[PDB]
Design a protein around this ligand. Sequence first.
Ligand SMILES: Nc1ncnc2c1ncn2[C@@H]1O[C@H](COP(=O)(O)OP(=O)(O)OP(=O)(O)O)[C@@H](O)[C@H]1O
Ligand SMILES: Nc1ncnc2c1ncn2[C@@H]1O[C@H](COP(=O)(O)OP(=O)(O)OP(=O)(O)O)[C@@H](O)[C@H]1O
Ligand SMILES: [Zn+2]
Ligand SMILES: [Zn+2]
Lengths: 184, 96, 48, 362, 145
Amino acid sequence: VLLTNLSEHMPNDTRLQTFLELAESVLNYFQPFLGRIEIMGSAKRIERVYFEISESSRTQWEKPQVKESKRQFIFDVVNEGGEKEKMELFVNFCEDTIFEMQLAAQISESSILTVRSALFALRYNILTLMRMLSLKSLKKQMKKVKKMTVKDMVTAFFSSYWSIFMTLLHFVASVFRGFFRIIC
Amino acid sequence: ELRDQQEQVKEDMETKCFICGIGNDYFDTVPHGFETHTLQEHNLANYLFFLMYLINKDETEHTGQESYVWKMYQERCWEFFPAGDCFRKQYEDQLN
Amino acid sequence: ELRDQQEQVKEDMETKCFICGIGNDYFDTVPHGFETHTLQEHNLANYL
Amino acid sequence: FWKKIIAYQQKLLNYFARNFYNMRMLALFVAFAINFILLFYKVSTIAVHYVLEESSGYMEPTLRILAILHTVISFFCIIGYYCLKVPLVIFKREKEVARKLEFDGLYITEQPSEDDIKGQWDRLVINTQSFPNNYWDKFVKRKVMDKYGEFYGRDRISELLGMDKAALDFSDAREKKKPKKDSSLSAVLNSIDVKYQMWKLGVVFTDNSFLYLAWYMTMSVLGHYNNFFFAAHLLDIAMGFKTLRTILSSVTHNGKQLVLTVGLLAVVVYLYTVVAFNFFRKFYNKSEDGDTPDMKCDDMLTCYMFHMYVGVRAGGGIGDEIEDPAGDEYEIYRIIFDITFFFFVIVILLAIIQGLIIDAFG
Amino acid sequence: TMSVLGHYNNFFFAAHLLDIAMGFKTLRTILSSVTHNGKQLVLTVGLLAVVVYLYTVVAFNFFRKFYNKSEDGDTPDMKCDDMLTCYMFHMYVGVRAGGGIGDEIEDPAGDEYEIYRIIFDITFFFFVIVILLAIIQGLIIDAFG
Ligand SMILES: Nc1ncnc2c1ncn2[C@@H]1O[C@H](COP(=O)(O)OP(=O)(O)OP(=O)(O)O)[C@@H](O)[C@H]1O
Ligand SMILES: Nc1ncnc2c1ncn2[C@@H]1O[C@H](COP(=O)(O)OP(=O)(O)OP(=O)(O)O)[C@@H](O)[C@H]1O
Ligand SMILES: [Zn+2]
Ligand SMILES: [Zn+2]
């Protein structure tokens, strides 16, 4: 906190800027726990206050119910609220939120198969398509295509995509079968 | 009507700070200036956290600034809330 | 249309003084400056 | 031999990639021709078979020619899609997985959540030798190694990314190798990367635009056994046309509030069916044969179906299709029942549906 | 020309009442709501013409016994034994009906295709009478704004 105050009030000093990097780990550990607000001080000047935020306060502040309460409060202030009542309604909301967070802190004391089936269907149905590649006996196809014809390249070029489409159909059917087996 | 009401809240929160009321035009003279102001300087959650700290802190253990804020809170005067002013505007010539 | 007409009046009265026509941005350099101007300096009831 | 045959292969691939969008407009024009010929399609008499009426006689051969042309064009639109828009999908997937490996450590510090199919399927491509095949950054493995190597291991990271351990060092050091031949079938079969082409096929099979185009092909193939599956190809206007997407966006913008409004109506007309089944049962007779009644609210399911179908589709509510309540002990109650059904279902709940579509245009 | 033709038949002088849109400048604000989104009111009718076609297909393939339009048992008046006739029936009577196609066809109770035909009718009512006739309303309304 002393280092943060010195850094934010001496923003162009290089000796402090070559000394702050010597405390990055400490200044990174306390970043979540370091509070920082701004007030109009007793000297008629804007002053910056540094305080401590505990982990329980942040955990209860980041709860879904408190966030929804904050959204509703902000909506109400913006729409149905004025400007002279803003900092009064804000304190009234902060007090209720603090009491709720403090009560929650004390009271709080101490699909997968569906994805797996689809993944297995992909694996199996793609290995079925890849086994004809992993044959090494396509030398017979090579021998009959060796008499080159653009017609036969057209035919085989269409046949590869037809095989891909058939593999996709098999994969879809396997997924449907697995879904029937896992719904019940 | 319920759509315009929800859009107005978003517009106000994206174009004006909740606490000070200064527009984003002033703060966006430095990159991500409005984000820095509304998440580090004038965060509305930080003011709630400060009030919690002040309330849960012993009265004989406040600093002078904390005692000043505590007295104004106890007599319900909200002039310790920056309104139209901030650090980077008060010290604009020094900071920049 | 009747909703936008009523919203425009509120927006104009909250963002501009009735008499001088100066916006609230100028007056809100002092806390509650627009309120002070529109209720003590340029109040439309005071002119009546 | 296998320089020129691949040259012709690239010629065909480029042709189909170029004409993907032009054959996508032709498969929509052939559909409006098949479905226009299908408007002259009768049923003839028991052995019942559908016959295509024709005075000219030119419709039947034309329909069979157009049924094969549509099937050919649909397959060409799948080939064209694979040539054109699949490389973009592969590039986008390869960029995301690489940047999650590097800047998030998705497979070093974290792991997929076992319910993300993309995250679990992207495990195979990490170890592949043909990784960033489409993504530009060829140094992503060397970057993840430099980043996470010291903490998690020169050897663990190398095993995970499938990079060579020590043969690279020996090759920078002293070794010899022998070249190979393009014409060699063994060379081609060894060069092709099985584990990467598996992940690529797995991604294409999960693509939401390849699956739709495959459905378009399957329902065109099924259009030869029965020529009425070519009417399912007229659902393609929403995708082909870009001006029918502004009209169809009003429904789909608030498309989740139009489903929770029908569900709310299904609950409201249920609370009315409860009241009718408990109190108004003598008023649900639907015939003049006095000997045999046709009571449609003597069972809860039948009464609920009656209220959901006839009362809902009625222009004044349930009271237009049930017995007159005059001169009965439950007369004012049944008048309230009918008027509230009309107000809350026919008027109000059928106004929310209108307003949801209207508020989407704005 | 239509004033000259009004001398042979005096009823061509009724075609001169279409001139109010041009002569009057206040009837052009009302008539601009239709013509502002005037291209979306044509692609919506075309979309309805395709939707009621996919319903006619289902009716002609599965629901043909329910389209008899007389009580003379000797002579049926089947209006979905031909695709064009069934499409005209669906486009005219089912579309102009206030509850959908199901108000003008046989009752489905006590049939094997009963829940399917209930779904057919309720979806026709929802998608055509309610939704597609709401897009037309909203297009005119969003033009005034
Ligand atoms: N004084 C202020 N304190 C906090 N946020 C402010 C302030 N002034 C303006 N804002 C704006 O309000 C926004 C808050 O938006 P919102 O209410 O959606 O919550 P959020 O911080 O985005 O997170 P969440 O919705 O998850 O709670 C901030 O992103 C910021 O731009
Ligand atoms: N010259 C002006 N004189 C008075 N009010 C002004 C002037 N210029 C702007 N205003 C604004 O007009 C507002 C008046 O609002 P409104 O018409 O609702 O009446 P009100 O003062 O709030 O009270 P009431 O509604 O009870 O009569 C003031 O609050 C002020 O912000
Ligand atoms: Zn601020
Ligand atoms: Zn003034």
